Input
Amino acid sequence: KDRIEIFPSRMAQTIMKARLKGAQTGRNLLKKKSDALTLRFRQILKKIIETKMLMGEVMREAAFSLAEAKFTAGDFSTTVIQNVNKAQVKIRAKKDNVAGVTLPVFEHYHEGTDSYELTGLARGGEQLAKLKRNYAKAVELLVELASLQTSFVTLDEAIKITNRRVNAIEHVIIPRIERTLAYIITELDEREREEFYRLKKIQEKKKIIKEKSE
Amino acid sequence: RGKLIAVIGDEDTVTGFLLGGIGELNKNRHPNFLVVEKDTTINEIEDTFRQFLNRDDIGIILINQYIAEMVRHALDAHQRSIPAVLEIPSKEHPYDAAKDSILRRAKGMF
Amino acid sequence: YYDKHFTEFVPLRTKAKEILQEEEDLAEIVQLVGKASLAETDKITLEVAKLIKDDFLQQNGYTPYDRFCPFYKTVGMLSNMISFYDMARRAVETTAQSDNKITWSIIREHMGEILYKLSSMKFKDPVKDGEAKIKADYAQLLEDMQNAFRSLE
Amino acid sequence: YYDKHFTEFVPLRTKAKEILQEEEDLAEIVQLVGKASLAETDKITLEVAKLIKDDFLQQNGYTPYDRFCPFYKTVGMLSNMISFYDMARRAVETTAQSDNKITWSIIREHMGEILYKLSSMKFKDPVKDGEAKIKADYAQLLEDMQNAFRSLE
Amino acid sequence: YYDKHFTEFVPLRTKAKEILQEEEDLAEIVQLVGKASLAETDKITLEVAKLIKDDFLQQNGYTPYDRFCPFYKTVGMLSNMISFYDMARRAVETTAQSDNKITWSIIREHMGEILYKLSSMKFKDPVKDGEAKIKADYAQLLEDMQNAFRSLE
Amino acid sequence: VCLFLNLANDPTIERIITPRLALTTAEFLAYQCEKHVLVILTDMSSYAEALREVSAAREEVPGRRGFPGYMYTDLATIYERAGRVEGRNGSITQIPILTMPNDDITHPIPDLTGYITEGQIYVDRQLHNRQIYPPINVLPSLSRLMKSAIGEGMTRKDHADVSNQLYACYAIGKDVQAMKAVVGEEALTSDDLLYLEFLQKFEKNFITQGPYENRTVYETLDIGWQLLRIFPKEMLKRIPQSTLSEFYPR
Output
């Protein structure tokens, strides 16, 4: 509660002082972990905002390219949506050891299975081909973008856990060690005093005996 | 092999990505995508979104912003990392910026 | 002595000590964790332990109702508090692996009237309301709990 | 005395003390971060220091093999363990920032039997076994380690 | 004493402590924000508190002009710095409603010469520039200062 | 050298006059014969123990932690018989050497000494276990008179500047080393790596010396610069540009 409740002793002083040094060292090392996570978090934040901005422009261009494909082809969306079987793009999970914390990152995997070739409506193949490329690039950006968000909220959780532990060391564990140590120091001086009293009285009693002998 | 990307969006958005080479059928003939039409209700969108969250094969989910507002409670309720959800501007709805889940997840960003 | 006159008192005494000790064992770590890693079975212990602490262990000796606490009242209201613990702990233990887990927030909102009634058990004034009314009152709280649990689980 | 008779002990003694003290400092952080981030050299120091703590500085004095370990044997044992350390440290630092990066995991898998032999040196059993053989046996361990690292690099 | 001889000293030292204390109180907000999500009125406090810390509370005794600061100079310097503070707070607050507002960046860029003149006040050597001249220069600074703010409204 | 040896098995009262005889000689040599005397008093903790024995012989009631209540004035009586005097060219310095019981600087022996001395050298244990000799830790040490000891006309112009920069670089190197243990080698930037290079070479070249290598003040400073030239000029924030332009190159 308020004290570790170790009986006052010189041994307790040594243990408590070593315990305090350990707690202070842990506090400083965890504070550095938090600072490293906070810098990385903010960096991820800078890239994610700029990436989010870029995503806007890239998706706009892809959406426009679709308009051109539709202009030429007419209604290709019906065939594309219905005639779906296997993917050409797949995402493999990878681990990135950014710091003590390990974060999940996505990695783009070009599986290789061929996409559908469609020249059925007005044979608008070139516009569909440019459209494939524009969205293909869009997906690659988005994959990167998820590795931002998927590696980001995990940093916010890691920071909250680290800071909570650091705060407890600072607000709970060390104050408690310092109160215990100060308690020990005071009680040991109290024991020193009662020894002083008895020794002083012993010296006076010896003096009285000596006077009686004269 | 590892993970697929699920897409929930309007006709043009889904069509674009499918041409992008992303999206496929599962072994149970289920599709990892939904086309959201004007006649599609909230329960159907949410049921699809959740089922992707409960599927171990998906992971990144791509949605339109306007949809994110339609079923917004389902985007904040689940906090993990599999379901990395990216919100993209629809053909006509304008550039996203506000009400981004991640932008909220950090309150220190302009 | 207790077996001769009461019987129910001793297992209630044991369960009460286990709840209070378990809460202390948790409080040591909760101060550091922030109630983030607690299981639903542990949150029940923590809040029932509060119920015991605030309503059972403390009493205002300068009131007409807490100036004297006849033994039959102490064991009576303790039985209800422990009965709640066992029923609330069962409610989550039988549902945690199902398709809907009865978390503390669900039982807390569903049975808020029971938690208030349990806290009111101190305000019985044994001089004005004698043993017969107090025992009948506590029996009603037990029935109210059982009926609310049947509607919950 | 040591320089007259052995010539090897003084520098082995210095390196052994460096390893044990470095281990204590690395232990302080490992207990905190769980080895999430360590330099490859630091990983070797921790693992060789465990080899030393368990298979050099620890002995059962009621066994025929460790009732008394003659100094020539003590030096033999330490010479091999440090020789391993230097070769393991050289290999990972020499191949660092290149293509065929060598790590501890690669060394342990490549020459796992070398660590077993090093951990077995306490069992050569002096007096029952001869001085000439024990020296020859430790010489063989050194030759095997040198060939094991040569083939790894 | 202060009322009889200087009159304005007492409210000035009160405001000075408030500005300096607020700079400390804002320290946590600045550390976690970087002066981005920060009120323009707080930016005035931070930068003016710096001015106070730099060109008032700091004193360089190895310079012939700063060996001794007469009281009338100490209150002169503080009066003009706080008078600036008050004008800067009003410039932002009275225009902060909508459409066309004043910010600290606008004030600092707009009247950079005035902020410099405030810092320059410590160089008024009492040995060569008499009481009337230094007070006159400080009075002119106040007028130049208030007029610079006037152009912003 | 004038050497006084009071052995552990010698009379304990003789241990009390031993430093008084050494200082009496130092005062004669220094102040009457116009020369500079360095006085080294080794194991003042053993002196303090002999003083406690004398107190018991007088049947005095022990003071704080068993030591005499006059331990303060007794240590001052020894220590303060040193320094320069007006009108004479002699001087006495002292380097008392004290063992800290239980390695606690709070103990009355180092506490009462430090309270009446000017700074401390401070020998550590970690540096010793790492087989560094001498094992002297520069971070917790202090010499309050260094400001007057060094500088043009006494050692070299750049002495004060080299010391301050080396202290900052060592403190930072230790701080970066602590960070490395948390974030790893790949998470460090170029400046951090330079501080780690300094830290390793500082201890190997500057602190590690050996018992038979005598490094004069000018060679020590030159070694300092060799370590400081690890960093580009702009990182040496505590050295004025005039000093850098004179000493930094070459």
In short: The first strand of chain F starts at residue 36 and ends at 39. The longest helix of chain F spans residues 159-183.
